[PDB]
């Protein structure tokens, strides 16, 4: 079985490259971040522009939702993260401590903690309420491209241009595992699977890999796309068929069957690299976003 994603809406508004898109956990909203220093909020089902959230001094590389859909956190070249109250648009806290660009960010499932990764080669863990840094992990020897908590928040996975994925104990800060396959390309993205068993990792050799975390083994590889330069997000799509979804440097969105590793669809429409994709939590909807020559976000919907 193959899905049939079809283009429904195109969202224009950002004035520079879009850097990340994320659906709110409650399914109502899409948040986007951009090199234009802005966060924009859009209706998840109709693509209707809702509001702009402003405050960063330089471009934003990542934005992420709290699990109750009330807060956002953003990571900026201004070397800060900002915590936002979405309803009021207020910047609640500015998280200062990284010594270089902040590249990636996420809340833990409880949403009492934020994890961040930076060009300063560290991972920081921050208290959401106080906006204060709790731990700094000397995690990598090159910029940190992604950070993500597991299902219960007890672990953090990080990835780096240094070619490593590392798993950290949230509470103690200890490195529990280092994962790397037979070659050492920069690792450009990682995240835990929805069930927490696996880690999905992208490397800048045109490859996505599914790792069994507990066993430290690569189980599956997904290929066919182009990814040698950009830190492109990847997703697990779970509302219909079980897919892996990723942007590509040939301007397409790729969708693979998770189990069989076959490509099941390619989405054409963007005019530049698709840097970010997101999958809606309840409906078969994919959001995709593109770089500077395009500047748009697209919403695609399928019957499977």
């Amino acid at each position: 079985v193959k899905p049939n994603y079809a283009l429904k809406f195109t969202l224009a508004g950002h004035t520079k490259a879009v850097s990340s898109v994320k659906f709110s956990p409650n399914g109502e909203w899409l948040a986007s971040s951009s090199a234009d220093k802005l966060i924009k909020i859009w209706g998840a089902y109709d693509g209707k522009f809702e509001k702009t959230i402003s405050g960063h001094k330089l471009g934003i590389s990542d934005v992420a939702w709290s699990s109750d859909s009330n807060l956002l956190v953003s990571a900026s070249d201004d070397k800060t993260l900002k915590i936002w109250d979405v309803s009021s648009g207020k910047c609640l806290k500015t998280l200062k401590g990284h010594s270089n660009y902040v590249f990636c960010c996420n809340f833990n499932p409880q949403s009492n903690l934020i994890v961040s990764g930076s060009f300063d080669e560290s991972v920081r863990i921050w208290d959401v309420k106080t906006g204060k840094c709790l731990k700094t992990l000397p995690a990598h020897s090159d910029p940190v491209s992604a950070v993500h908590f597991n299902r219960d928040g007890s672990l953090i996975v990080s990835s780096s241009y240094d070619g490593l994925c590392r798993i950290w104990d949230t509470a103690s800060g200890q490195c529990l595992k280092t994962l790397i396959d037979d070659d050492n390309p920069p690792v450009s993205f990682v995240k835990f699977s929805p069930n927490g068993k696996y880690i999905l990792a992208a490397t800048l050799d045109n490859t996505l890999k599914l790792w069994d975390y507990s066993k430290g083994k690569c189980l599956k590889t997904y290929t066919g796309h182009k990814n040698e330069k950009y830190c492109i997000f990847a997703n697990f799509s779970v509302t219909g068929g079980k897919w892996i979804v990723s942007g590509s440097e040939d301007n397409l969105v790729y969708i693979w069957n998770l189990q069989t590793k076959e490509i099941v669809q390619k989405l054409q429409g963007h005019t530049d690299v698709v840097i970010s994709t997101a999958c809606h939590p309840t409906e078969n909807i994919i959001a995709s976003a593109a770089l500077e020559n395009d500047k748009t976000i697209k919403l695609w919907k399928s019957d499977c």
């Binding site: 520079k16 490259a17 879009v18 850097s19 990340s20 951009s34 090199a35 234009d36 220093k37 330089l58 471009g59 934003i60 590389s61 990542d62 900026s76 070249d77 660009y101 590249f103 060009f119 910029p143 241009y161 920069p186 450009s188 800048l204 330069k229 950009y230 830190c231 840097i275 770089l291 500077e292």
Partner: peptide
């Protein structure tokens, strides 16, 4: 030059 680390690329 593109304005963010992620949109600039490796």
């Amino acid at each position: 030059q593109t304005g963010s680390a992620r949109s600039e690329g490796y």
